[PDB]
Each structure stands twice: as C-alpha cells, then as structure tokens.
Design a protein around this ligand. Structure first.
Ligand SMILES: *[C@@H]1O[C@H](CO)[C@@H](O)[C@H](O)[C@H]1NC(C)=O
Lengths: 395, 408
C-alpha cells in the first residue's frame, strides 16, 4: 500500500469560503475510497491567489511528490491550472465555475466537477423572455469568473434579441458603477460578484435608492442565506437598510445534489450524504457533493491508469495516462452522473429563488437541455406584477 | 573585491528573442548596466555591491511564476524584486510578495489595479500608472475652460478602473460628466448615444484595437472636426492606425493622447551628476544589438531607487547587527522587509525621468500630452504631478476652428 498524495487548496474565508464544507466532504470521500493509499496535504488559500502562490511553492518544492493538485476558487484554480503544465501536473477543481477554465489550450491538464457558470445564462434569458424584458444592464466585479460569464451572457442575449444597454465594472469599489446605473435609469440589472462585494454593491444601492418597484436585480444564488445581514466594517449601511435594498431580488444557482432518492457509487443517497456531512460539521455546503465526487473521479482514474510511485514533474508519460482516464470518466456520484467534457455542461438544472421578506423562497427550476421551466407560482411583486425594462410612453 | 559582500536583487523581465516583449527587457539592460556601473565606481554601497540576478519571465504567467519559484529555490538570498513588465506576470508576482517579505520595484507595469495597497502592499513602481493621466486631464480641462465632458470606456478592468478613478479626481472641481458610455466589442451604439447627448469633449479609455473602431464610429456619426475634442490614451504603438484610411484620418485629426513622459525635459544635473540629455546619449552609445525602449529612463532611475533604499536600510548605529540581519535574510524576516519597505517609501531624488518620489507606492511623475496632426503625434504639453502644473508648448497644439471647441 504505497502512499499517493493530493496537494489541495481549500478556501476557509475570502470571496467564496467553500473549504468550510468541501474539506470535510473531501475527507469523507478519502475514507470511503481508501476502505495504493490516497493521502491529503492541504492549506487554506483564503480564496486568495497571493496566499495560494506561497502554498503552491510549498507543495511543488517540498517532498513528497504530489500526483494531482486540487484547488477550489476560480482565481486560485486559474493560477494553478495555468502554471501546472511546468510540472506536468493534472489539476482537478471541485469549486471553480469560471467559464474561461473551459479553454483547453490555456488549461491543458485541468478538470472540474463544478459545472461552468455559463449554465446561469440560458436561465437568465428564459426569465427575461417570461417577463418581457429586452433591455438589461450589467455590473460586474473584475475577476475572470464574472467577466467570462458576462462574455457568454452577451452572446445568449444577442441570440434572443435582448440588448445589454449599459455596463459597469469595478475592481473593489462599486460606488461609481452604482451611481452611473441610477443616472442611466437602468431597470433590470445583472450583478456578478462574490458575496463580500455584493454587500458593498447593496450599500451603494441603498444610498442611490436603486431598489424598489421599478428595479429588478439578478444575482448569483450561492451566497450564504444571511449574506446582506452580516456585519461589514467596509459598509456604513445598517442591517435594516441592507434588508430593504435586497428585497425582491432574483437569484440563480445550479442544482448540484441529485433530487432523486437513488444510491450512488458510494452507496449513499443524497439525503444520507447531507446527514453524514452534518455529522462532521457553513460555506460551500451546496458545493460539497462536487468535492466528494472529485475524490471518487480521481480514485477511479488512478485505478484505470494503475506505476503511481514513479510519478515525476519532468515526465509527461504518467500525466497523459491519468488525463485519458479522467477524460473517459463515467460514474454515478452524489452530484449525479459524473463526466469530463470541455464546456462543462453535465448538470441540466438551475434553481431560481426570490428574496421575500428577508428570506429566500424557491420560485422555480430551469432545464435548458429540454427547455423546461418548472414554475411554483410563488414569486411576489409590488402591485402584483413585475416592472418594465424602461419607460414606453414618450411618443 | 573578494571581501565585498553582495546585496542580491531578483531581476524579473522578458528577455528571450522568442517573445515580442523580450525587446523591452533587452532594451532596458544598457540603462540598468549604466546605473550599476556608476553606483559601483562611486562605491555608494561600500563595502557591499549591488548583485542584480536576471530571470526570464518570457512575458508568460506559467514561465514567470516558475522563474520566480526557481529564483527562490536555487538563486542567492534576494533582498528585493526588480522588474515585472507584462501586467499579468507583474500581478502574479506583486500579490505574492508578502509570502517572502520581498519589496518589488517595477519600471514598466502601468496597469491601475497595482495601486491597490490591500492587494499589493509591497509593490512600488517608478513609472506613472494609467490613472496618473486623470489629474493631468483635469488641468487640461481647466486650461481650455471645458466644464462638461462625456466618457467612452471599454468594459475591461484596466479601462473601467481609470474611468472609476476619474470621478474622484473631478470631485470638488466643477467639471460635469454629462454622459457616461461603455462598450464591450462595439463602440458604435455608445458613440451614437454620446452624439445624442450633445457631448463635445470626449474622455476615452479603450485599447489600441478598439481605438480604430471608435474613430470609425465617430466618422459615421460626424463626431469630429472643429466642434469636437477627443482625449484618449497616448500609449498606443507608433503608427497604430497604419473605415477607409482617409476617413479614419479625418476623424482622428486633432485628438489628444495622454501618456507618461519617457525622459525629463529639464537640463538639470540628476543624482548621477548627469543631465537627462547626457544620460540619453550615454544610453544610445551603450546599447548595441537592441532597439531603444521607452522605459529605459524608468529602469535607470529604478536602479538608483534600489541603491538609495539599500543605503538607507544600512543607516544605523546598530551597524554589525543590521549587516548580520542582511547576511542572514532568507525570506522569513518580517523586520528586514519592513526596514526595506520604509526606506523605499522615503525615496526623494532627481532622476533622469524627473523628481523620483512615491505616493502609496505610485510614482509622482510627468505626464506627456500629444496631438494627432497629419499622421504624426506632436508633443504639445507636460503635466508635473508633484507641482500639479501644466505647461502647454507654445505653437504646437492646434484647433480646426478659429477657437478651441466649446463644451456645449
Ligand atoms: C510613507 O511616506 C509618506 C510620505 O512622506 C509618509 O506620510 C508616511 O508616513 C510613510 N509611511 C510609513 C512611514 O509607514
């Protein structure tokens, strides 16, 4: 039983604190896979490329040799996947949604169990069509995960005869973009940023009065449920002001846990995985099934390739064999049917929610493959119906 | 001398003939060599010597990161980083500095996000950044009495950050941004919106490829001539333009470009005892198998910043302890990193690029104004950030009308 090491990064804080539930999910999966021996060497990236750079150095320049790298965040995964070719290392992410990571020329040894963020876009388009909007505004924080999602959204809106009439971007301070959205009289707004930046955006939204009956915000649904209620020294807005600014907004997220009560390769049902993970415990709870399945995907790919002690960073041979096994992966995990295609579309469903009276309510689900919008009729709007995308009365 | 200890510096830049940007690294090396030559001849760092080690980034994220990692693993105990030319490579290095207690000095990375001190606390640059054009434009607007402007920005980080910075520069200044327009791949819709809002003075922030599309849309919308003033980035490649060419040229006539000033116009003796003009001639004589680089003066002054920082880092009556701490450095000493950071922060001398001084790691320098006049970019002015003064060159700047355009 030779030891085989995984060099992993877990974000315990930062943009997406996914490591909080994904690290225990990885630990639960390793126990199951082991019972060669798969061993974990891990560090807290804090969802920070600067911090990950120090830990990447320690993983690569210190013994033991690692067969695979496992990063979380899109920014950390982008840095490690770009660099990995220099060490002929396979990179496997459990949390990276960045559409840009689908670029095989730029990331030739990269795999992910997390779907591409492009899956939010057909759902956003379906809702724009449902609600009769042809004019949308966008505000994004400048991490590539968001910029590349917006690049895809621009293509999907153009295809549907919908226009992005105003765009604003920021690196850290959204003050100017939000003021400009207000002055442009933008109505339907898609905001792409991490939870941390979402608080800064919504405090500016409160100050500019860019909320109410006329305004509809579309955000990413994987924030913590209480995201707008959390103390933040970088914001002057109170909890009640924040709560009013976020009222009625729409979110989209990808369904990552199998909704059917079946038993996967691990012999667990989606429901038992949740109790088991809860027994071990939170950021990354919704992504935890992907972390669990990433270990299984690796374990099965290592089994098929089976000379592992001889892996070196200067040799392509073992890398190419593992790549081919990963490429041909096909098994049933807690997240459903696990496979590894370039454009990251193995998941068929998105979950749509609306914030009502400070709490998220499920309003529907969308399957872009079959074009099925499952609607709960649980959405609420001031006056009983959604607003317009602009004034229509100036003859 | 064999008894002369090294003060090792990690030089990171593109050098290879295989990459287009290798010409920058190769182009600044004669400037670097001249500074090192004189510092040693003067024994400014006595009994030590400045040991600059060179590592090729190849202007590539993966190769740049490995060059850095290999410099740490296998090179001598570097005290600081000198370089970073390609913005993406510079960012990867600059954000990670604290992990190895390394202060970095760049002579070529101009992107605005590197000014973020929360993300890049240990990062310094001798070159004025892309945001440095904003206080200069403010002085230009005040000069020609332009109180109403429109903005046209490409929705990309480096441009949106300059535009966001602009609001803060214009605050309390009595200049209105009457219309803010942004585009991703097609400026035509945004140009049409600016025309519809009767904007006359346009502040543009977009790349070289987008500039041709912008001027083509301006031509189609008749947003050029005596009634209009376009103020755009001045860092594009020479003859970047070379719409039918004649129509593009009609729309481009009189546009103002804004960029850093490569060398000081003042005939004053710098820290080296040489005027900027004498340095320029010595630079052209030293370079042999390389084309000139517009960052050469910034690289030259950059070596002087490192030398003056090191000299300051050694100024203590606790001499033997300080020398021992320097000798012992192995990236783990937070105290030495702090001493170096504080010493660099104190920089204040007259360099070949003008007065070399930092404001929160950003260069307080000189901005050059150019105007497009018949397929040639003519220098029309200089803005000095320290003095906050604008000097317009007499008999250079021209307007198609009898008077400069009105803002309305
Ligand atoms: C850096 O230099 C500035 C300008 O002279 C000074 O105000 C500031 O205190 C310095 N920062 C330190 C010493 O940490």
């Amino acid at each position: 039983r030779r030891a085989v090491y995984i060099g992993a990064l877990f974000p315990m804080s930062g943009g997406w604190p996914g490591g909080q539930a994904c690290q225990p999910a990885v630990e639960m999966a390793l126990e199951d896979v082991n019972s060669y021996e798969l061993k974990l060497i891990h560090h807290d990236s804090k969802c920070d490329p600067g911090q990950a750079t120090k830990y990447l150095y320690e993983l690569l320049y210190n013994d033991p040799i690692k067969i695979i790298l496992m990063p979380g965040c899109s920014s950390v995964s982008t840095l490690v996947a770009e660099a990995a070719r220099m060490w002929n290392l396979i990179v496997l992410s459990y949390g990276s949604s960045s559409p840009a990571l689908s670029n095989r020329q730029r990331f030739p040894t990269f795999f992910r169990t997390h779907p591409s963020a492009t899956l939010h876009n057909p759902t956003r388009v379906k809702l724009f069509e449902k609600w009769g909007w042809k004019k949308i505004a966008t505000i994004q924080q400048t991490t590539e995960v968001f910029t590349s999602t917006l690049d895809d959204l621009e293509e999907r809106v153009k295809e549907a005869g919908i226009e992005i009439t105003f765009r604003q971007s920021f690196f850290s301070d959204p003050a100017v973009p939000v003021k400009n959205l207000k002055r442009q009289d933008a109505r339907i707004i898609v905001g792409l940023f991490y939870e941390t930046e979402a608080r800064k955006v919504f405090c500016e939204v409160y100050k500019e009065r860019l909320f109410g009956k006329k305004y509809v915000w579309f955000l990413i649904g994987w924030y913590a449920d209480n995201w707008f209620k959390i103390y933040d020294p970088s914001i002057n807005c109170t909890v009640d002001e924040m709560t009013e600014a976020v009222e009625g907004h729409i979110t989209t997220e990808i369904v990552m846990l199998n909704p059917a009560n079946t038993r996967s390769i691990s012999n667990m049902t989606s429901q038992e995985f949740v109790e088991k993970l809860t027994k071990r415990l939170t950021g990354g709870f919704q992504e935890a099934p992907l972390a669990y399945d990433a270990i299984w995907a690796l374990a099965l790919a290592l089994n098929k390739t089976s000379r592992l002690e001889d892996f070196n960073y200067n040799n392509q041979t073992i890398t190419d064999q593992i790549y081919r096994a990963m490429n041909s992966s096909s098994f049933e995990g807690v997240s459903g049917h696990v496979v590894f295609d370039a454009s990251g579309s193995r998941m068929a469903w998105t979950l749509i929610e609306q914030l009502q009276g400070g709490s998220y309510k499920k309003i529907g689900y969308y399957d872009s493959t079959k074009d099925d919008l499952s609607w709960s009729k649980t959405d609420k709007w001031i006056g009983g119906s959604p607003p317009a995308d602009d004034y229509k009365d100036d003859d | 001398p064999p008894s002369s200890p090294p003060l090792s510096i990690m030089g990171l830049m593109p050098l290879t003939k295989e990459v287009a940007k290798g010409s920058i690294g190769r182009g600044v090396l004669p400037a670097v060599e001249l500074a090192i030559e004189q510092i040693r001849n003067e024994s400014l760092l006595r009994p030590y010597f400045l040991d600059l080690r060179l590592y090729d980034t190849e202007c590539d994220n993966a190769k740049g990161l490995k060059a850095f990692y290999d410099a740490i693993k296998y090179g001598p105990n570097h005290l600081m980083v000198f370089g970073g030319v390609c913005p993406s490579v510079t960012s990867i290095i600059a954000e990670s500095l604290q992990g190895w207690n390394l202060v970095q000095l760049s002579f070529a990375a101009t992107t605005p996000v590197l000014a973020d001190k929360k993300k890049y606390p240990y990062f310094f640059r001798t070159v004025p950044s892309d945001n440095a054009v904003n206080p200069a434009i403010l002085k230009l607007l005040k000069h020609y009495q332009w109180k109403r402007v429109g903005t046209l920005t490409q929705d990309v980080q480096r441009f949106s950050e300059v535009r966001n910075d602009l609001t803060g520069v214009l605050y309390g200044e009595d200049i209105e941004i009457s219309d803010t327009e942004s585009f991703s791949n097609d400026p035509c819709t945004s140009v049409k919106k600016l025309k519809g809002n009767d904007v006359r003075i346009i502040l543009g922030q977009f790349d070289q490829n987008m500039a041709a599309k912008v001027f083509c849309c301006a031509y189609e919308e008749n947003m050029y001539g005596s009634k209009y003033q376009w103020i755009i980035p001045g860092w594009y490649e020479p003859s970047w333009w070379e719409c039918l060419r004649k129509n593009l040229l009609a729309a481009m006539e009189g546009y103002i470009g804004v960029d850093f000033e490569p060398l000081s116009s003042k005939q004053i003796k710098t820290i080296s005892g040489k005027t900027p003009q004498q340095y320029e001639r010595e630079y052209n004589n030293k370079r042999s198998g390389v084309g000139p680089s517009k960052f050469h003066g910034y690289a030259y002054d950059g070596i002087w910043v490192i030398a003056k920082t090191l000299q300051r880092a050694m100024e203590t009556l606790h001499a033997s302890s300080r020398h021992q701490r320097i000798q012992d450095f192995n990236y783990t000493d937070h105290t030495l990193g702090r001493i170096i950071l504080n010493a660099m922060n104190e920089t204040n001398f007259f360099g070949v690029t003008g007065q070399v001084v930092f404001r929160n790691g950003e260069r307080m320098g000189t901005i050059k104004f150019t105007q497009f006049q018949d397929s040639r970019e003519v220098k029309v002015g200089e803005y000095n950030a320290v003095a906050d003064t604008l000097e317009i060159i007499n008999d250079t700047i021209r307007f198609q009308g009898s008077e400069p355009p009105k803002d309305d």
